[PDB]
Amino acid sequence: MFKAVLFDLDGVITDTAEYHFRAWKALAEEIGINGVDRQFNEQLKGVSREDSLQKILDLADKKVSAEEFKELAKRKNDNYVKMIQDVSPADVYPGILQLLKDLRSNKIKIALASASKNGPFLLERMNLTGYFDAIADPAEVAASKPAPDIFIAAAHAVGVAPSESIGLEDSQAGIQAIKDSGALPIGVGRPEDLGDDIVIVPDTSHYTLEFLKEVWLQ
Numbered sequence: 552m553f554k555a556v557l558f559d560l561d562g563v564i565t566d567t568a569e570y571h572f573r574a575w576k577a578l579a580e581e582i583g584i585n586g587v588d589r590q591f592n593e594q595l596k597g598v599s600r601e602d603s604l605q606k607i608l609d610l611a612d613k614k615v616s617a618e619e620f621k622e623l624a625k626r627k628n629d630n631y632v633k634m635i636q637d638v639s640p641a642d643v644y645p646g647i648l649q650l651l652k653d654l655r656s657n658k659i660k661i662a663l664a665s666a667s668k669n670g671p672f673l674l675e676r677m678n679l680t681g682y683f684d685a686i687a688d689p690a691e692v693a694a695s696k697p698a699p700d701i702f703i704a705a706a707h708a709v710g711v712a713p714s715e716s717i718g719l720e721d722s723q724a725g726i727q728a729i730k731d732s733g734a735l736p737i738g739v740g741r742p743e744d745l746g747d748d749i750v751i752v753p754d755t756s757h758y759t760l761e762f763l764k765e766v767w768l769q
């Protein structure tokens with residue numbers, strides 16, 4: 552049986568993928584780039600703050616100073632951090648709180664494998680911190696999603712092999728990161744976005760311990 556579940560945060564635990572999208576699009580438009588629509592945003596899900604800004608600049612062939620780059624990333628983060636102040640336990644996605652409870656009852660380790668430096672704050676806002684056996688610090692890894700490092704680190708932090716772990720993701724980049732870690736991915740979203748080659752569920756109510764077992768037994 553699997554021994555750990557490795558959670559992405561944004562778009563898996565709560566609806567903060569929407570907030571990142573709104574903040575990045577606002578930033579992009581302030582600098583005169585309007586290609587950041589929902590379709591393009593599928594390339595931004597899972598990607599670090601600086602990598603996201605670079606993808607937006609590259610979309611437009613735009614070349615800012617190092618000083619401006621730093622200011623833009625900070626501006627977007629400051630806006631995002633204001634957006635999330637009112638996140639609460641009521642914003643936890645369907646199924647997720649019960650999944651965490653059921654995993655703990657079955658002695659399955661729970662680790663956060665999020666790129667977000669705002670992750671710990673968000674788990675506290677949602678009264679979820681106590682469910683997590685570890686939070687992999689995304690500043691510690693040498694390579695960000697789609698590299699597998701953050702999922703490998705999350706599994707290591709709870710003493711479980713990636714190959715005995717399930718990863719939960721809503722992003723193209725994150726699904727690739729899970730694949731390359733050796734863990735088993737279960738995506739949440741549209742197969743049109745996430746692929747026809749892994750198990751995908753349409754919403755997080757599908758993330759039950761029963762279903763994770765169903766999939767693992769395979």
Ligand SMILES: O=P(O)(O)CC[C@H]1O[C@@H](O)[C@H](O)[C@@H](O)[C@@H]1O
Nearest residue numbers: 596597598599600666667668669
């Ligand atoms: O470090 P932060 O700026 O809080 C978030 C860094 C990245 O986290 C990921 O979980 C999201 O899918 C990305 O959209 C985001 O860019």
Ligand code: ALF
Nearest residue numbers: 560561597665666
């Ligand atoms: F949506 Al994440 F790390 F929380 F990619």
Ligand SMILES: [Mg+2]
Nearest residue numbers: 559561562721
């Ligand atoms: Mg996500």
Ligand SMILES: [Mg+2]
Nearest residue numbers: 680681682683
């Ligand atoms: Mg604790």
